[PDB]
Amino acid sequence: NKCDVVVVGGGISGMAAAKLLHDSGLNVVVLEARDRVGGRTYTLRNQKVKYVDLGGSYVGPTQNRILRLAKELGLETYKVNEVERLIHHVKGKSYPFRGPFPPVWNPITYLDHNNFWRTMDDMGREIPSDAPWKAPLAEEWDNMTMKELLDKLCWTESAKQLATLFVNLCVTAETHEVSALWFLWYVKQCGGTTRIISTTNGGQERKFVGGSGQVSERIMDLLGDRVKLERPVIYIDQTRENVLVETLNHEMYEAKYVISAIPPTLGMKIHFNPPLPMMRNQMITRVPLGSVIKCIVYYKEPFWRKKDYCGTMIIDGEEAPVAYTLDDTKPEGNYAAIMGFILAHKARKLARLTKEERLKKLCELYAKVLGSLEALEPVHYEEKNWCEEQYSGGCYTTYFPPGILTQYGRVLRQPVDRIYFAGTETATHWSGYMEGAVEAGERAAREILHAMGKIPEDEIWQSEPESVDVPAQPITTTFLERHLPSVPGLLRLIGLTTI
Template sequence: MTGQAGPGGAGTTVTRRALLGAAALAGAAAALPGAAADAARRRRHKRKRKKRKHPKRPVHRKPAGARSADVVVVGAGLAGLSTARRVAAAGRSVLVVEARSRVGGRTLNHDVGGGVIAEAGGEYVGPTQDHILGLAKEVGVDTFPTYDPAGSNNLYYAGGSKQTYSDSSPLGTAPPDPLAVSDVAAVVAQLDQMSTSVPVDAPWTASSATSWDMQTLETWLRSNSSGNQRFMNLASVATRAIFGAEPREISLLYTLFYIASAGNETNPGTFERLFDTPNGAQQFRLVGGSQQISLRVAAALGDRVLLGHPVRRVVQTSGGVQVQGDGVTVNAKRAVVAIPPTLAGRIDYQPQLPPLRDQLTQRVPQGILIKAEAVYDRPFWRDAGFNGTTVSDTDPANVTFDNTPPSGTPGILFCFIGGDAARKWTQVSDTDRKNAVLANFATYYGDAARSPRDYFEMNWSSELWTRGCPVGLFGPGQLLEYGPFLRPPVGPIHWAGTETSTYWMGYMDGAVRSGERAAREVLAEL
């Protein structure tokens, strides 16, 4: 998912000026449904309501300069912005408080020059991701196919040898390694079947939830396959790219839920949809980069989005809730905390959160993932019939994709570095890591790959307000015991973020879904 030019650095920082530019592109009316009728709606909502009885809460005086809204949202990623958009469209007042000087959360556009954008964070969309695709359409962001034309080849590199293959085979993007193919086919079929018994809204209630959450994915794989090293290497490559983790770090129940969630209300999830490009989660990209969606929504919200104000404290009050951030205080009737659980746990809550909700935030670490990208004058690998997709047993670049813009130039090749590979290669210098990545690219596609005109990375684990990617992880025992506390509100405090989604957890679609769900919750209480 990501891009960094140095330690702790990021790709292009998008500021308030960029939001104004996005407003000119999108238009407030296009990005915010019913904007013209907001004032009328607000007048209609000024009716008397019966006073509700609440437990006694501390009374906090409104500090000088504090702002007020019906709803305050913490976090201006896709989840938080989706919440705010729906709340505003319903005629309610809303403010979004964001720690960074940009919007977009785990999506980030990086300008490689000449107005060309490469995604340094989440970028792909695909079938059954109806909510992110719907939002993109509403704000005027088009999709285009990931480069994978008919007749092009994927590359598999293992044991020092190259093998080309088509992802139109029954295995999809998974390589047909003769030493692992039978294990891959059998294991994927079994995981898909098991996942059908996992309720996406409550995976901890599955009939086998206890036994599945007592073991890691790796334990199960070794017990249900030949366990040969080539197969286990492929399993690791898959989980590094999908979770930013190794198979030993995630529970079997969590894995099955993740598979089940890779669908929608009418199409059951499958592992193939997670991993594949054709008909999978990597099928399409977004014109102008994925962050463009957040930029356009934020532009429509205008000064309701407050950037550069890390939230330090959330206080329940007699009137609802008070959010205290650096340089800003917001009083509201309801709050939506739309950030990863591990970040939500770093906020000071008064009164303290219920113990099990608090414990949850201590048990869902972010995955570790680096996205490294090389920029060339042209995508030379296409000349040999390659589509840029590589699966490899060699670190650090285990998985690569063609990230070239729709115009065809410049050529951009990126890799994911996740799990053990990320832990190892974050401990070397930036130069050594870059050289290792380019050496891998050259092994796969020839010496021309050693000399890009530009190279950048994003290490999301060094990003202060994300602390890892692509998603929060549940190890053995965690989903069963603490999963039930992911979504339920705590008083006037509601929760959003892709980790709270029932479908497409860990993806942009899950973020949008979670924001829309949180908006429904708060609107029902106002």
């Protein structure tokens, strides 16, 4: 089977690459391991739920590429519910609030909290989005975990605990598992702490009507039979004039170039000839994905709205199986549902239970957090544990442990002869997200267009017009937020005065 480009992987990244290549007149083939396209996006359809996203789902302002792609495919978005109050549940009690952060009243504690978020963003501006290893203190920040950085920065337990929950929620890993340099890069390349955490004006603002899985499905429709399902790639041979790509079900494909659009560590599932160079060879053993179970509990009505709760809950505590939820009710107001994430070590701990026992524990938690016995009367339940996926490795994305990003980072998207690398991990804006997948898939496709002499070099990286449907408000601070001292800053001032 002969073509111009073989794309390995039919998730969003590979489908976007294939689409770009196909629209340019090339012959592409997509080799997908599963019986479906979409990868870490998956939309379940049945009569009880109508449709529901079990993997990637949320899109928001500044994610202009996935928005343009989805629009061009005939899809619409709608807004996640944030009309009523959010809830911060901490030490067994719920405190309703509005805004990006639960209010903090103790003035010392307020100083510590304000300095925490501020400093994450301050450190982040030192870090180039396209080369995090070029930060001036890249080595010092990469040689520490997030846990060590939090221990040094937070002068109250309250700030340390909120921060810990933010890390677990952002990257589905524990603070002691991840590099400080990598996590700080990861937040900055999504636009910063406010953009990444928020619903209104942030990452979680919207969902696609009908599910995100339609993105990959509609591209598959346009490509017709160029997409080969149940073709896991086992072997890539670059020793001859054309590249040979072999599949597990005994098929051979021959091409000029290959795009690898799979998570970096799943490159281990492929035997290479000749062997990868040393740096990539080791890099793909060093970059695990996080751990998460996405759970959706359905109810007769969205009862929390009547208590003036929008359904967003930040839930702190070792005993809480779920640390964050959002209202997952359909835009029409039916199929009332709460979506929650079970994160990092709790995904591993609670996977031992049955589905019915996990549903029990979530309802009892929601009943307590919402102060509502109706939470004990679910009508349906769907869930997916991504830790068990042979062809994903986890979700949402790949994290870097201490020391890895500075030593091996520069190789993530470095071509290996005629293999180019897409996949959301190799993006520079919303890496980890469906937005990053589109950016990486189209950039890798244009690297190949450039190698064939079809476009000039300055067209490999291409900026994206802002969505007219999902405008981005800028992220602003107040004068007090900018200039209030940190806790040790204030202690320093007290020392000074006392002389």
